[PDB]
Structures are given as C-alpha cells and as structure tokens.
Amino acid sequence: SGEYPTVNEIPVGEVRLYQIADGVWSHIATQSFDGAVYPSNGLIVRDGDELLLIDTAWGAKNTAALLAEIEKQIGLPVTRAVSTHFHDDRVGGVDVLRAAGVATYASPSTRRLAEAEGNEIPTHSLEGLSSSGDAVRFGPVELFYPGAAHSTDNLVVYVPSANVLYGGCAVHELSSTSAGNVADADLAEWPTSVERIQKHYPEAEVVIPGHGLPGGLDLLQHTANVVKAHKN
Numbered sequence: 001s002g003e004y005p006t007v008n009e010i011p012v013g014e015v016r017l018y019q020i021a022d023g024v025w026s027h028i029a030t031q032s033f034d035g036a037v038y039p040s041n042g043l044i045v046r047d048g049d050e051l052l053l054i055d056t057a058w059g060a061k062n063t064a065a066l067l068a069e070i071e072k073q074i075g076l077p078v079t080r081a082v083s084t085h086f087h088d089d090r091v092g093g094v095d096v097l098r099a100a101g102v103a104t105y106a107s108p109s110t111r112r113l114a115e116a117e118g119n120e121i122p123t124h125s126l127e128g129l130s131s132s133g134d135a136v137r138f139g140p141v142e143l144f145y146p147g148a149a150h151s152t153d154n155l156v157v158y159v160p161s162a163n164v165l166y167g168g169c170a171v172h173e174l175s176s177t178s179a180g181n182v183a184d185a186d187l188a189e190w191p192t193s194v195e196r197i198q199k200h201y202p203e204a205e206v207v208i209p210g211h212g213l214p215g216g217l218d219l220l221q222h223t224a225n226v227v228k229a230h231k232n
C-alpha cells in the first residue's frame with residue numbers, strides 16, 4: 001500500500017514495482033539461496049515509448065513475473081536490459097529476457113565472469129567501461145564503472161533526468177549491519193570505489209541499493225562504513 005516492498009509483502013513467485021521518480025521505477029522480488037530468503041532490486045527507466053531494464057529479478061520465473069508486472073503496471077515494451085554484475089541476482093533471467101525479444105547487455109568483464117560461473121550470459125558487450133571512472137551513455141541512463149567493490153565488474157547507473165543513482169550491489173541499505181555476500185568482493189578497494197561514486201554523482205537525490213530500501217546519499221558513506229567493519 002505505498003511503502004517500499006519487502007519479502008513480507010510480495011506474494012510467492014511475484015514481483016512488485018515502486019515508483020521512484022517520473023519515468024523511473026525499481027523492481028523488487030524475492031529469492032532463496034543457500035536456504036535463506038532475500039529481496040533484491042532492479043531498475044526500470046522509461047526510454048520514450050519503450051523501457052530500459054536494469055538487472056533481472058533473480059531467477060527465470062521471477063523475471064517472467066517481472067515482465068508480466070511491467071505489462072500490467074506500465075504497459076510499454078522492455079526493449080533492452082543491462083546487467084550490472086555477473087551474479088544470479090543480476091543475470092539470472094537473461095534467457096527469459098532474450099526469449100521475450102529483449103536485447104541484453106553487460107560489460108565484457110561481466111560476461112566473462114558469468115560464463116565462468118555457469119550463469120546466464122547477456123548477449124551484447126558494453127565497451128568503454130574497463131577503467132575505473134569510465135562512463136558511457138545507454139539510452140536514458142549513464143553507466144559508470146567505479147572500480148572493484150562488491151564484485152570486480154560492478155557497474156552503477158545514473159538517471160540524469162531524475163538524479164537517481166542506482167548503486168546496485170556495490171551500495172547497501174542504511175539498515176544493513178554487514179557487507180552482504182562478499183565472496184567476490186574487494187573489501188580493500190570498495191571504499192575507494194564508493195568515494196569515486198560520491199565524487200562523480202554529488203547531486204544524486206535518491207540512492208538505490210542492490211538489496212533493500214532506497215534512501216539518499218548517506219547510503220554511500222554507510223556502505224563504506226559497513227565494509228570497513230566487515231574487513232576488520
């Protein structure tokens with residue numbers, strides 16, 4: 001009923017959308033992994049009479065449900081998708097997208113890591129993102145590579161029309177007390193990568209983490225703090 005969706009308010013197998021700004025939504029879904037249940041976020045950005053999708057809904061059936069929820073709530077076609085790193089909460093569902101005619105994209109780094117992991121692999125490679133601080137335009141967003149953080153390949157996404165910063169899994173929600181799933185992280189580089197985000201996007205009004213509740217710019221410093229304490 002208008003609050004940011006959580007596992008307790010998303011019916012089983014379902015996806016919810018949340019309006020972030022004009023022409024910007026997040027998508028929220030639930031998945032189990034190693035016997036625990038987690039929410040995860042992605043983004044939807046209106047691109048004229050089409051939609052750009054950022055990240056899958058973490059799984060094939062969740063991603064099919066995402067497409068249905070978009071049709072119900074928005075009614076514009078998803079034409080392109082970008083995955084912001086190689087983990088299954090970002091690429092799991094890419095095959096569903098591709099069979100629904102969505103063109104799927106990721107950096108070459110992400111595509112290599114996904115292939116090596118046995119995860120689904122986006123079709124198209126996003127060049128121009130291989131050095132930290134790199135940025136490229138992609139429809140109504142800017143893609144930015146801040147350096148290694150949650151993963152070596154993680155990308156962040158900025159929606160300039162709305163000053164929305166989608167941090168993905170490099171950014172944690174304010175209530176978080178741990179650095180999440182760090183198996184592929186660089187805890188030493190992570191603060192430096194966050195500082196790059198902070199420097200590059202000082203006008204961000206909304207910051208969206210990969211998992212949990214959106215907030216403001218404070219999510220960035222909070223993330224650096226949680227990571228530093230995990231590392232120690």
Ligand SMILES: CCOc1ncc(F)cc1-c1c(C(=O)O)[nH]c2c(C(C)C)cccc12
Binds near residue numbers: 087150179181212
């Ligand atoms: C093990 C604890 O993990 C988390 N704890 C709290 C969170 F808010 C997020 C995660 C989490 C993340 C992430 O931190 O991005 N990624 C995950 C994955 C990927 C590899 C598919 C699986 C299971 C959990 C997570």
Ligand SMILES: [Zn+2]
Binds near residue numbers: 085087151
């Ligand atoms: Zn991840």
Ligand SMILES: [Zn+2]
Binds near residue numbers: 089210
């Ligand atoms: Zn994640």
